[PDB]
Design an enzyme around this catalytic site. Structure first.
Site, PDB file in Angstrom:
ATOM      1  CG  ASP A  82      -0.350   2.206   4.556  1.00 36.04           C
ATOM      2  OD1 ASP A  82       0.448   3.005   5.080  1.00 36.04           O
ATOM      3  OD2 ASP A  82      -1.386   2.546   3.949  1.00 36.04           O
ATOM      4  N   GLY A 191      -4.102  10.190   5.400  1.00 37.03           N
ATOM      5  CA  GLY A 191      -3.718  11.492   5.891  1.00 37.03           C
ATOM      6  C   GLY A 191      -4.608  12.035   6.989  1.00 37.03           C
TER       7      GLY A 191
END
Ligand SMILES: [Zn+2]
Ligand SMILES: [Zn+2]
Lengths: 302, 290
Positions: A82, A191
């Site tokens: 990530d 997010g």
């Protein structure tokens, strides 16, 4: 078995549903997640940020993951670096038997971000490993970005952001579709924690202090989802949910000290919180839609 | 290298020292233990309770334990099943690539203990795997039991510290101390202070253990000391930083807490620096022993 992001997201785009992606950092977590996806017969993406790898000196994390692959072999699991920074991190994650990579150069101007990305793509696809990148949000910008790089998916920007503190008190789906349409590839929402309300109150009532802590509320993710968004990145919620439980158990019985006595529950909350979430993402039942292509066979695509 | 318990202790006994045996459940715990042993060039016994293996579904432990072996090649590491009970529990842990196993049937009368252990020893040894049993005690029984079972190590009921030499000498083998926790003023007080509440808890002085080791306790089973230390740091972070909420942010300091509570223990045990002492014989080669 271990699954590519082209594919797991492939079947996601096609079938108007989205797969939740979870930063893992240790066993109780990899376990919490796994218990959920398995219960709802669901595909899963397990994310290891560059901080997670160091936290776990790489090997433990590779190993924990291989336990999951092997414990639940009929559940499409993708392991995904990530927020890649360099190309050498990706050499690192690829070396770890990882099967998807994110290269995050979105902080560079277009042409630099384009170049870094292209260099990662060239490596990864050579190995069958997939690649996710990030832009921004002009739809054409996207179209250029993708055409010029050939990535298997796009992190788009519709004003979410990392951590428990996203909006002062308690989003552009309108852009997600065009971007989706004009690009033909799956999009990605970083997010996308929710700070579910049960998670929060529990941390807060048990000695903790985050009396603010907004999130993206699920309805927005559901909406986004059908308008293209296929991969949903979820981190905070997980952290939050384990921490509430630990704190709970510390107050309600301060004589206990075997970490198993709070990590074991810090685990079961992760799994509980995850379950409605996954369910609304609409990936349940889908785990066995497909013959999972391996990396060597994934090479053919490119 | 993955190491048999017979050897690790054989050296422990012969050179007059002990190897600390450390209970494992999860990642951060193994990093704690490892950093210490490495930092002290000590052989290590990783212990896996049956509780433990259940909490970690077997497969996460097999695999963290495996990461120790490849991250720290030059360290003689032995993976030991703890507090076993059934033949099937051994049969299983053997196949998680374990290297050593305890069969605790010291609740059953002395004769049935013998039968149950003899059961495991035929199994273990056939694969090279080492075997620890338990009695309790009285020295004479310790002799015959070994005579009749042929285990590679024997835990005992003992503080009492004169039996340990007798039992050591009549049996001629590596003894083992279970429930070997000190409960240092500081890990307890770190807890009680930051909100915990286990106040007494009856410690066992490290000085006693050292004295025992010279009498031939070669293996020192530590669990609760490790558990405490972790719940030490996590409470600290919870108070000083009510806001912090990432597992790494408190799970990190627990790991260190473990590392920094093992280091004196090991030192005292005296395996500090013996890690390069020998060439590790392996489960295959070790069938030869039996
Ligand atoms: Zn991101
Ligand atoms: Zn015992």
């Amino acid at each position: 078995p271990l699954c590519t992001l082209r594919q797991m997201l492939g079947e996601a785009r096609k079938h108007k549903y989205g797969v939740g992606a979870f930063n893992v950092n240790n066993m109780e977590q990899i376990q919490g997640i796994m218990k959920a996806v398995v219960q709802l017969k669901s595909p899963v993406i397990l994310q290891c940020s560059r901080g997670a790898l160091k936290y776990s000196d790489m090997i433990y994390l590779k190993k924990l993951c291989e336990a999951a692959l092997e414990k639940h072999p009929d559940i499409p699991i993708c392991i995904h670096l990530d927020h890649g920074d360099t190309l050498e991190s990706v050499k690192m994650a690829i070396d770890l038997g990882f099967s998807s990579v994110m290269i995050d150069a979105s902080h560079h101007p277009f042409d630099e971000n384009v170049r870094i990305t292209k260099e990662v793509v060239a490596y990864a696809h050579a190995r069958g490993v997939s690649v996710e990148a990030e832009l921004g949000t002009e739809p054409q910008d996207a179209k250029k970005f993708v055409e010029l790089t050939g990535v298997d998916a796009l992190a788009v920007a519709i004003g979410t952001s990392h951590g428990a503190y996203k909006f002062k008190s308690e989003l552009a789906i309108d852009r997600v579709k065009t971007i989706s349409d004009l690009t033909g590839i799956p999009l990605v929402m970083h997010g996308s924690s929710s700070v579910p309300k049960d998670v929060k109150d529990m941390i807060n009532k048990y000695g903790g202090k985050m009396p603010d802590a907004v999130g993206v509320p699920i309805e927005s993710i559901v909406h986004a989802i059908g308008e293209g968004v296929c991969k949903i990145n979820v981190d905070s919620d997980s952290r939050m949910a384990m921490t509430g439980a630990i704190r709970k158990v510390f107050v309600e019985h301060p004589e206990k000290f075997d970490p198993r006595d709070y990590l074991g529950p810090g685990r079961d909350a992760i799994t509980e919180m995850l379950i409605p979430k996954i369910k609304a993402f609409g990936s349940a039942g889908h785990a066995g839609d497909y013959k999972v292509v391996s990396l060597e066979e994934a090479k053919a695509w490119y």
